[PDB]
Amino acid sequence: SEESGLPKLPVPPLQQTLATYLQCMRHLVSEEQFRKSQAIVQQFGAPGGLGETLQQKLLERQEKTANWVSEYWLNDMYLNNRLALPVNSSPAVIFARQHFPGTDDQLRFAASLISGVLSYKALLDSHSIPTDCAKGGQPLCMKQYYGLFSSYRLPGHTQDTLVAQPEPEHVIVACCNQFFVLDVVINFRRLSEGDLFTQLRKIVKMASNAAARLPPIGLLTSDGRSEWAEARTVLVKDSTNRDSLDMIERCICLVCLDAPGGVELSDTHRALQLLHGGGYSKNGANRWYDKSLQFVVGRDGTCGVVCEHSPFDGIVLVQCTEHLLKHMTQLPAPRRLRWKCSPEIQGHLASSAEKLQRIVKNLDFIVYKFDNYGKTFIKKQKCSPDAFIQVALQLAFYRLHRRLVPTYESASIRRFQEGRVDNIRSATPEALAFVRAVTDHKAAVPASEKLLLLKDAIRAQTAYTVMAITGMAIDNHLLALRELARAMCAALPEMFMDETYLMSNRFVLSTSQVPTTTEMFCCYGPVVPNGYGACYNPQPETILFCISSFHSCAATSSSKFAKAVEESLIDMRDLCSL
Ligand SMILES: CCCS[C@@H](CC1C=CN(C)C=C1)c1cccc2ccccc12
Numbered sequence: 001s002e003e004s005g006l007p008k009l010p011v012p013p014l015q016q017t018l019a020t021y022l023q024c025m026r027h028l029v030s031e032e033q034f035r036k037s038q039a040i041v042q043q044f045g046a047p048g049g050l051g052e053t054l055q056q057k058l059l060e061r062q063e064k065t066a067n068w069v070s071e072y073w074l075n076d077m078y079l080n081n082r083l084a085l086p087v088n089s090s091p092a093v094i095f096a097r098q099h100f101p102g103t104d105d106q107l108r109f110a111a112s113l114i115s116g117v118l119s120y121k122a123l124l125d126s127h128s129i130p131t132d133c134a135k136g137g138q139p140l141c142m143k144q145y146y147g148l149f150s151s152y153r154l155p156g157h158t159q160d161t162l163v164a165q166p167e168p169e170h171v172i173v174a175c176c177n178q179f180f181v182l183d184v185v186i187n188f189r190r191l192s193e194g195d196l197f198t199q200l201r202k203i204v205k206m207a208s209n210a211a212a213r214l215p216p217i218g219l220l221t222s223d224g225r226s227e228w229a230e231a232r233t234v235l236v237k238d239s240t241n242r243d244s245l246d247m248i249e250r251c252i253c254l255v256c257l258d259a260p261g262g263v264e265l266s267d268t269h270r271a272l273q274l275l276h277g278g279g280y281s282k283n284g285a286n287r288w289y290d291k292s293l294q295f296v297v298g299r300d301g302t303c304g305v306v307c308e309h310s311p312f313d314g315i316v317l318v319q320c321t322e323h324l325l326k327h328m329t330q331l332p333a334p335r336r337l338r339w340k341c342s343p344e345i346q347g348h349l350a351s352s353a354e355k356l357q358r359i360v361k362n363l364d365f366i367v368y369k370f371d372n373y374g375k376t377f378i379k380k381q382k383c384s385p386d387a388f389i390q391v392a393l394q395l396a397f398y399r400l401h402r403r404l405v406p407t408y409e410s411a412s413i414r415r416f417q418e419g420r421v422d423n424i425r426s427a428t429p430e431a432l433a434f435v436r437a438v439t440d441h442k443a444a445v446p447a448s449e450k451l452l453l454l455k456d457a458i459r460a461q462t463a464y465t466v467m468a469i470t471g472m473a474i475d476n477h478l479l480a481l482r483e484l485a486r487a488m489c490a491a492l493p494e495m496f497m498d499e500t501y502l503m504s505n506r507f508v509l510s511t512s513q514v515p516t517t518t519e520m521f522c523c524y525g526p527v528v529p530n531g532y533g534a535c536y537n538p539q540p541e542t543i544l545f546c547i548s549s550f551h552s553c554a555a556t557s558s559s560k561f562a563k564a565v566e567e568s569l570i571d572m573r574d575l576c577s578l
């Protein structure tokens with residue numbers, strides 16, 4: 001009645017997780033390091049040993065909590081991360097290209113979008129969104145929907161805070177780096193699209209007035225999390241700033257009326273604008289990255305949403321955005337938020353502009369549309385499209401870099417209460433056997449044998465996927481054992497100080513499938529300096545890859561990786577056509 005009917009997240013058996021862990025890492029560490037890790041794990045999991053003690057504590061935690069990993073996972077994946085949110089953390093979703101002859105066309109789109117946000121939020125708030133079922137079925141957790149609009153991520157010196165929340169409700173409109181409170185309710189009557197248009201015109205006019213222009217405070221939210229915690233602490237010394245921060249913290253979402261980009265509106269360029277606004281000289285300060293959703297409606301027709309994803313993952317977000325876009329197809333003045341700055345704040349602003357520009361220049365990003373085939377061909381090979389593509393990315397990484405690396409693939413655990421994600425470790429032993437056969441010409445493995453190895457790697461990938469989505473994989477389980485150990489003693493046991501364990505969690509290849517039904521697509525940066533981010537959207541006859549890496553790292557190249565992906569998909573096609 002008041003409590004969820006969903007199952008709780010399972011706790012895997014301890015020995016199952018330790019065995020899977022060792023077999024995951026054997027081929028990714030040296031033989032000497034692996035021998036040491038084998039003995040460490042044996043001691044940790046011995047009868048009556050520490051692992052068994054921690055496992056008992058984890059089963060007590062499962063009984064006392066709705067989800068035993070929620071707190072640890074939120075802190076480990078997001079709130080402890082000190083990197084600036086743009087590129088490093090906040091994914092971008094790019095909508096179909098739009099065409100706005102005049103400003104009023106841009107404003108009519110933004111008015112229509114805001115109206116759809118208000119309608120969707122009314123469905124949400126009255127619990128009218130139909131329960132998702134697995135594979136589009138077993139019911140899925142719906143809690144992430146309540147985090148789409150009611151969430152604000154506060155910076156902290158060492159750990160951030162995720163705050164959940166209002167009479168009336170308002171959005172914040174960002175224009176020319178200025179922020180305006182737009183109430184979306186007058187006399188308890190929701191503003192119509194026409195009223196919203198009229199209000200947005202008032203905002204664009206006020207934002208263009210240089211005598212009222214205020215400093216670009218939003219730039220500070222683009223900095224490292226400890227840097228922005230420090231600058232925000234300066235701001236909150238003044239009551240005007242506290243009032244303005246409070247208005248942003250409690251808004252529904254941001255709507256960002258970006259200026260024209262001046263670059264060709266390719267898919268790659270539109271994505272760059274959604275990821276980091278092009279830096280301070282372009283739209284990079286027209287942002288507030290702590291707020292969960294920042295819809296961008298650019299003057300030139302670049303539209304999308306920038307997502308702070310501590311409160312929700314991408315499947316729920318795409319459900320929301322597709323509903324918004326599909327249903328677009330079917331009076332007091334807004335208040336400028338004022339700011340009281342100091343010489344301190346000017347220094348923080350200049351430093352944030354410089355730090356953001358390093359991120360802009362460092363990001364190597366490419367949108368690559370593979371057009372030779374898609375899901376239809378892959379399914380004719382008795383393969384899951386996701387597993388086939390994951391194996392292709394392993395072959396791409398191996399043929400370019402001549403090793404496999406610890407790889408992350410998001411797996412939804414929404415089958416369980418409060419469920420977010422666990423990790424599918426796609427760098428399997430079977431994937432290694434396959435990529436070596438394909439690339440080692442002197443070994444002269446027959447194509448017929450490469451095909452057997454291909455299908456066994458796809459089998460192993462599919463098996464790991466089922467394991468992860470049913471709560472039986474290893475990353476969340478080890479995370480909880482680690483953090484329960486830390487509560488006993490700040491000195492972690494050797495199990496988690498082991499270089500094999502640290503190595504295992506540096507995801508040089510970080511991936512996810514985010515399928516969409518419209519022309520929209522999702523992207524994000526890498527999670528380690530020598531890594532890639534790879535987000536793909538498989539369609540019946542094509543596959544879209546968004547590949548990121550950092551220009552600082554001489555080993556990686558997004559262009560070269562996309563070419564290796566193409567060659568791998570062609571190789572796999574030829575093997576399946578024997
Ligand atoms: C379970 C479905 C995908 S969850 C997340 C995946 C992910 C994101 C970043 N890295 C580095 C690696 C993986 C994600 C992807 C794309 C867009 C998102 C938008 C909002 C929220 C999450 C999004």
Ligand code: NA
Binds near residue numbers: 551555
């Ligand atoms: Na690079």
